[PDB]
Symmetry: C3
Subunit: 153 residues, 3 copies
């Protein structure tokens, strides 16, 4: 029962996380994390390098918010499909999980292409009747990724 509850909570979180970004409700995105959080976007191969280079990196909620503010100030259509989560550990109301994802993007030419494929590797805080990310690492396969005014994965 407790397993089913955490599974559903995390899968609901991921569905709403994808729709928040795809709908361009970027202001909601930082609220899905705890204040003292970690969000990063790193290439699959870099997750073995001595110095894993993140191409997007936020080590506080303030940095998440800074990104949303900048994206609004210095103003494609995105679509996430996120797989069902695999829970990989439970220590009380802290739950680790992973879920595959693909972000599809449609630009001005009108063709929808695969923009970024990867998997989320997460630590969720399920305390206090809520579901928020303590840490999310987007471990990605696709080489080309936006480096200027990039919308979150």
């Amino acid at each position: 029962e407790v397993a089913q509850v955490a599974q559903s909570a995390i899968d609901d979180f991921n569905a709403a996380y994808g729709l928040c970004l795809d709908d361009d409700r970027l202001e909601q995105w930082p609220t899905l994390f705890v204040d003292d959080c970690l969000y990063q976007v790193i290439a699959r191969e870099n997750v073995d390098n001595g110095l894993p280079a993140a191409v997007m990196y936020c080590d506080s909620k303030g940095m998440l918010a800074d990104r949303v503010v900048a994206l609004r100030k210095a103003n494609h259509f995105n679509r996430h499909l996120i797989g069902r989560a695999v829970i990989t550990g439970v220590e009380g109301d802290q739950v680790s999980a992973e879920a595959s994802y693909v972000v599809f993007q449609t630009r001005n030419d009108g063709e929808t292409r695969i923009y970024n494929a990867g998997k989320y590797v997460d630590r969720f805080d399920l305390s206090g009747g809520t579901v928020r990310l303590k840490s999310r690492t987007c471990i990605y396969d696709t080489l080309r990724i936006a480096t200027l005014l990039a919308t979150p994965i």
Copy 2:
């Protein structure tokens, strides 16, 4: 418990809806709607225009059935992946929800391409021990879409 029940009902509906179309069981498709229904397929940008042009439009079950009949009479391989649904409102046994989707298509050259990416915006009727669409709007990103003898999204 009631939330879990509606969530599961809608996610089961979407899984079976995608497989019905992909398997070419087109005769089942109109049965997934109530009689006095609305099905439409509209571009993301048109959902702000003064006159949102739908490229596929049915305002009764009779129109759904008319499409299936025509597709059979005047005879690609499709594959849907549908995200988990986000329930956006509940008024008794009427439930609104949204779910991301991508339809992949394989034509005679054998390459599988992204045909149509979007999100379903739905009103479900969960009354009377059943799950049927009152209305489904497929809000889509991908520019090119079939305009002759188009299979439903």
Copy 3:
């Protein structure tokens, strides 16, 4: 309740099955099947031919293991997205189900492409407090598929 239990078991199985292959934990893959199993990969159109040609075929766990051994001995990045399962029959603790899937692949040029789209047609053994495949047929749309040292779908 029993329906919800089988649904969750199968959807959890599929999530972990995709991640096992994508993570290159190929040694886990044969363990997801019973010993006297059937795994095959067959083109959609061949599922009507008098002699349906399978392009990947294993009729025991020994054959599954033989493939993993060969892949290790004679050494792309893959990403599965698997749809929610539709349960198509239940005879005690043997359950038939189907689920759409797309395997995305990223090769040396760095572009992520659609490698293989299809649906799983499965017979699950849910006896003895466990979830294992009795048979899985991957019925696929995409023409080009690896024929040398192919990683499982």
